């Protein structure tokens, strides 16, 4: 049992990536935002408050003959976004790229934040962190990956995000076709329930690599790269005009400027993010100030390797008894 699905950016900025998934019988196809930094499969639904859905495709559990209420079961989730979603829970058959999982917990939103209602391209989230983070009560549920593990050829998915371009999520195998050279595997701590690993240093442009341990999370659910204040300061110091703004709330730079690449260390290996991935365009339409894609971690409490860093690598989430994270060049 394997499965490959195409993931597609939702805008030209690559803010997020959507993957079609099949829920119910017969199938209702919803575009979900595959989030390795949460653990809940939640979807807009026939129960979602109708003042909170605006162009999204909804999951109608009443039309699925595989769909069943999980009586008394209930969910509430909060993101680093400040994003909120909550409601009740169904079991149903869920397929991703032809990999089918039956009795998947599908958490139907009665309630959804502004942030979600505002985003018409996202029909919900599919969480791929560890199941301890799942939010459903009184009985915690497991994630789609956990429900597939055993059935999979290898208990593994890869992420291969594209820069201004589609890419692929594979489940059950490693496409030795998709990366260059060697995959470097590095230890994962599951203790907080994240794909949490430790990077071995950084370089800015063609500068000297500084060996320093950076702990953070692989999170395809976050757009930007979030690194400590020290590291992020060295980065933007190399871009004439860049400053941290109170107003806009982050490093900005003049759109006319030239972003140097950013190198992160995975073991003895090195992944360069080309400077182009670090441009997130004008902070407002018409503005000649542009938003940087490396920002300070200081206000989250965690360093996040988000889409900006993962899109530069072919990434393997080895989800074995001893989980590991692989990076390759692509």
């Amino acid at each position: 049992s394997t499965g490959s699905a195409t993931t597609t950016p939702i805008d030209s900025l690559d803010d997020a990536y959507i993957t079609p998934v099949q829920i119910g019988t017969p199938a209702q196809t919803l575009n979900l935002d595959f989030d390795t930094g949460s653990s809940d499969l939640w979807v807009f639904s026939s129960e979602t408050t109708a003042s909170e859905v605006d162009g999204q495709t909804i999951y109608t559990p009443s039309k699925s003959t595989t769909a069943k209420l999980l009586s008394g079961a209930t969910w509430s989730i909060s993101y680093g976004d400040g994003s909120s979603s909550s409601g009740d829970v169904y079991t149903d058959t869920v397929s991703v790229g032809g990999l089918t999982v039956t009795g998947q917990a599908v958490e139907s939103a009665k309630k959804v934040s502004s942030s979600f209602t505002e985003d018409s391209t996202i029909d919900g989230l599919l969480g791929l962190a560890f199941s301890t983070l799942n939010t459903v009560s009184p009985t915690q549920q497991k994630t789609f990956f956990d429900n597939a593990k055993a059935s999979l050829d290898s208990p593994v998915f890869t992420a291969d995000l594209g820069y201004h371009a589609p890419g692929t999520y594979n489940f059950g195998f490693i496409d030795t076709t998709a990366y260059t050279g060697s995959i470097t595997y590095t230890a994962v701590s599951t203790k907080q329930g994240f794909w949490e690993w430790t990077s071995t240093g950084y370089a800015v442009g063609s500068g000297t690599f500084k060996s320093t341990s950076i702990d953070g999370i692989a999170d395809t659910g976050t757009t930007l790269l979030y690194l400590p204040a020290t590291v992020v300061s060295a980065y933007w110091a190399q871009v004439s005009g860049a400053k941290s703004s109170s107003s806009v709330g982050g490093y900005v730079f003049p759109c006319s400027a030239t972003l140097p690449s950013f190198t992160f260390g995975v073991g003895s290996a090195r992944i360069v993010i080309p400077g182009d991935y670090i441009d997130f365009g004008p902070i407002s339409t018409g503005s000649s100030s542009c938003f940087g894609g490396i920002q300070s971690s200081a206000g989250i409490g965690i360093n996040i390797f988000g889409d900006v860093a993962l899109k530069a690598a072919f990434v393997v989430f080895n989800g074995a008894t001893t989980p590991t994270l692989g990076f390759a060049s692509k």
């Binding site: 997020a16 909060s78 993101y79 329930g193 976050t222 757009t223 997130f280």
Partner: peptide
Amino acid sequence: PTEXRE
């Protein structure tokens, strides 16, 4: 931008 659990 989005910042997927807290």
